[PDB]
Amino acid sequence: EGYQYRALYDYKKEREEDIDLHLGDILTVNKGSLVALGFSDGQEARPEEIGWLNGYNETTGERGDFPGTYVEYIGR
């Protein structure tokens, strides 16, 4: 239930709002928490053209926002 992507790049938890991303990580970004900004029906599947997405990195058991370009939506 939500758009889950894969970590294409590695990011370092810099801002207290972003989290730690690493190639091979799994980001569980719900569908509402993502459209909570106003995206369009279909943008949720475009982290590179989305900007930032709040997902759950199960690999690190952490939750927060991250650079969408460093991910790759792959499905639910």
Specify the CATH number for the domain of residue 44.
2.30.30.40
Q: Are 54 and 32 in contact (CB under 8 A)?
A: no
Burial pattern 52-61, b for ≥16 Cβ within 10 A else e, equals bbbbbbeebe
The span from the CA of 13 to the CA of 73, in Å, is: 20
The span from the CA of 24 to the CA of 7, in Å, is: 5
Residue 68: give the domain boundaries.
Answer: 1-76
Number of domains within the chain: 1
The span from the CA of 49 to the CA of 3, in Å, is: 15
